[PDB]
């Protein structure tokens, strides 16, 4: 279907000694494929998926050089931001940056993004036009004037509509055996008595990819949200995801309840009822 490539960057200042901790990760859809960790020994961008390992030395050298440059940019930024906000040198602070591009089913550019946060709050973001900036406060407004003067949006737009989508397409091709394969949820329902006349039904979806999924309960064919619990979608640890939704029912009435599962890997939604 549609696809995306995203990079996530986190820098955390360490006032007591040394430079900020810096961690960068890259994803294609819900698959991590590269990482850089300033605490790690290599000091290089590293592969995290088989299909990227085939990239040659020029790739790895280039990615390493660029991500290291990002790290230094964030280091300076932390200093600049501390001044903007008139903060002490004593406290730890965080800069986060995320950018990437989405393509449609035809692998053509759909949208691009680039946003930046200080201490967990919006700071500045490129608008969807890839020309304008959303600055959240007056410090960010100062940054926005700086970035206007430096043609920053022009460069990001060129990257997001060009290099970003071009290499995404390359990756989707090289990793097609997994990146373009959907893994439908393996589903089942469990039953747990809560008393001698009430029970929890739990509808499980396991080992699915991508992470996007919808689990809903119906009673007698109408959606029910009362007395339900839906956990956040969570990584299995093997590249797939898990989720469950549960409902408390009067014992003996289990057959009224149906769990409905929607996922890209399922031509038609699944319906589960208790055994």
């Amino acid at each position: 279907g549609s696809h995306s490539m995203r990079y996530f960057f986190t820098s955390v200042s360490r006032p007591g000694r040394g430079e900020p901790r810096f961690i960068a990760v890259g994803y294609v859809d819900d698959t991590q494929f590269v990482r850089f960790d300033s605490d790690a020994a290599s000091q290089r961008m590293e592969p995290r998926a088989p299909w990227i390992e085939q990239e040659g030395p020029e790739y790895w050298d280039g990615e390493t050089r660029k991500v290291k440059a990002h790290s230094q940019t964030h280091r300076v930024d932390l200093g600049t931001l501390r001044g903007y906000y008139n903060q002490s040198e004593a406290g730890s602070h965080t800069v986060q940056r995320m950018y990437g591009c989405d393509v449609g089913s035809d692998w053509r550019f759909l949208r691009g993004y680039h946003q930046y946060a200080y201490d967990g709050k919006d700071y500045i973001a490129l608008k969807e036009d890839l020309r304008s900036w959303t600055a959240a406060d007056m410090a960010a407004q100062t940054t926005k004037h700086k970035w206007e003067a430096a043609h920053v949006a022009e460069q990001l737009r060129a990257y997001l509509e060009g290099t970003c989508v071009e290499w995404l397409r390359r990756y989707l091709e090289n990793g097609k055996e997994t990146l373009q394969r959907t893994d439908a949820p393996k589903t089942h329902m469990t039953h747990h008595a809560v008393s001698d006349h009430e029970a929890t039904l739990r509808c499980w979806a396991l080992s699915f990819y991508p992470a996007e999924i919808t689990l809903t309960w119906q009673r007698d064919g109408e959606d029910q949200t009362q007395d339900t619990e839906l956990v956040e979608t969570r990584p299995a640890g093997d590249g797939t995801f898990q989720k469950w939704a549960a409902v408390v029912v009067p014992s003996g009435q289990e057959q009224r309840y149906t769990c409905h599962v929607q996922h890209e890997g399922l031509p038609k939604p699944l319906t589960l009822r208790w055994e």
Binding site: G26, K66, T73, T80, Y84, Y99, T143, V152, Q155, L156
Partner: peptide, 9 residues
């Protein structure tokens, strides 16, 4: 492929 870094804030 990552982008080149932007100007500082």
């Amino acid at each position: 492929r990552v982008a080149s870094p932007t100007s500082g804030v």
